[PDB]
C-alpha cells in the first residue's frame, strides 16, 4: 500500500502538469471533454483469493477499445492530447491495484 | 491605393490597436516573470504593465485558473471595444475574427443539445469573443433540428452551414468533423474576403491565412494516422487556401506516416525548417510549438505596414498567445516544473 | 458482472481521467463523476459520495485529496469492505498520504 501510494504521487504530478501543455496548445479543450460523455474505454472486474481460509476481494483492470475522444484536438494540440490521455490511462491501473 | 480611403474610417482604430501593440510583454518582460516564485509575485510583476489591476477586487489565494480568466477578460474587453467603435469595412473584418470563436461555441451548443442539455448551462462556458446577440436558439434548445433551424435564423454562421453541413449531416457526423468542416468553409471565406480587400490588407492577411490553411492540413494529417478518418475525410477537411493546394494538399491526404508528411514539407522551405526544427524528442520544441512560433513570426509582420486590417487579426492572435504564454509561465511556477518554463513564444 | 471506477474532483483532474477513458453514463443518464466547481456546496460532494458508494455499477471511487478532506466525515464513516475509496494528489493540492484513514490503522508502519 505505502509503496503503491509513493508510485501514484509522482505519476499523478506528471499527468497533472502534462494537462497544462494541452491547455497551452489546445485551448479550453476540457469543456468539450467534460461535456461530451457516453461510454468508458477502461473498466474493472471484482475477483477473489481464498488464502489462509478467508475470501479477500481484489480488482483487475480491463480495456474496451473504443476511444470516445479519438478526434479531440484534431485541428490543433493533438500531439499534447495524445501524451495526456496516455499519462492518465497509465495512472488508472495503479489506482485499481491500490484499491 | 488604400490611403485614398483607409484613414477616413479606420485612422483612429489603427492608432488605438497600435497603442495596444506597444502594450505587450517583450522578451525582457518574460525574463522577469519566469524568475519569480509564486502567483503573488506574478501579480506584482504584471501590475507594472498594461495588465495593471487585472487581479484587483479578487481573492488573495490566487489560482492559475483565475489568472487565466483575468488575462482573457482584458483581451475580450479590448476587442469588444474595438468592434463597437469600428465602421462596416473594418467591422465586417473584425466579425471574421469572431467566427473562429463562434464555431467552437456552436460546437458546444450542438454537443449539449445532442445530449439533451439546456443551452442556458453552456452560456457561461462560451468564449466571450463568440457570444451571440440573438438568443432564441439558446432559449429554445429543444432538439438538434430545432437548434439547426434557429442557428440559420439567428446566427451569422448560417451561410457556412448552407455551403457544407445539412441538418442530416449534423445528426450523423462527429462534432470534431463538424468543427473542422465549419472551419474549412470559414477560413476559405475569410481568405476570399481578404483577397477582395485588395492591396495592403490582402498582402498582410494572405501570408497568415495561407499559413493557417497549411497548418490545419499538416496538423490534421499527423493527428489522423491513429483514427477512423479516411483519406477522403482528410481531403474534405484540408483548407484549399494554403501553398499546398495545387498538389501538397492531395499528397497529405494520401499520406499515412510522419515521413510522408515531411516529404510534403520538403517542397516548401519554411515548412521544411519547421519540421527539421522539431523532432518532438524529450526536451525538444515540438512540431506544434514550431507552428505557434511561426504564427507569431507572421503576426509580427502585420505592424510593418501603416494602412491595412492585418494588424487587428494579428493583434488578437498575439494577445491570445500572450494569454497562453502567461498561463504557461504561471503553471510552471505554480507546479515548480521550471524545466519547461522557457517554452513560451516570444511575441512583440 | 463488471464494475466501473468513479471520480469526485476538480475540472483539471476530471478532464485528465476522462481522456484516460474513465467517463460513462449510467442508464438513468447520470455520469460516474462530479466536477467540483468552486461554487459547489459540501452537500453536493457528500451526496455524490454517498450515491457512488451505494451504487451497484461503481466498484471504486477516486476523490481529490483536498476534496477528501472536505468530505472527511462521510469518507471516514464509510466502512463497507467491497467499494473502495482513493484520496489522490492534484497540482494545487496536498500529497498522496495526507491524513490517510487506512495508513493510520497499521501497527507495522514506520
Swiss-Prot record, chain C:
GO molecular function, one term: proton-transporting ATPase activity, rotational mechanism
GO biological process: synaptic vesicle lumen acidification
CC per GO annotation: clathrin-coated vesicle membrane; extrinsic component of synaptic vesicle membrane; membrane; proton-transporting V-type ATPase complex; vacuolar proton-transporting V-type ATPase complex; vacuolar proton-transporting V-type ATPase, V1 domain
Subunit-level organization: V-ATPase is a heteromultimeric enzyme made up of two complexes: the ATP-hydrolytic V1 complex and the proton translocation V0 complex. The V1 complex consists of three catalytic AB heterodimers that form a heterohexamer, three peripheral stalks each consisting of EG heterodimers, one central rotor including subunits D and F, and the regulatory subunits C and H. The proton translocation complex V0 consists of the proton transport subunit a, a ring of proteolipid subunits c9c'', rotary subunit d, subunits e and f, and the accessory subunits ATP6AP1/Ac45 and ATP6AP2/PRR.
UniProtKB keywords: Cytoplasmic vesicle, Hydrogen ion transport, Ion transport, Membrane, Synapse, Transport
Pfam families: ATP-synt_F
Entry's family note: Belongs to the V-ATPase F subunit family.
Designated name of the protein: V-type proton ATPase subunit F
InterPro entries in alphabetical order: ATPase_V1-cplx_f_g_su, ATPase_V1-cplx_fsu_euk, ATPase_V1_fsu_sf
Membrane topology annotation: Peripheral membrane protein
Superkingdom field: Eukaryota
Compartments (UniProt record): Cytoplasmic vesicle, Secretory vesicle, Synaptic vesicle membrane; Cytoplasmic vesicle, Clathrin-coated vesicle membrane
Residues of the signal peptide: none
Tissue: Expressed in brain (at protein level).
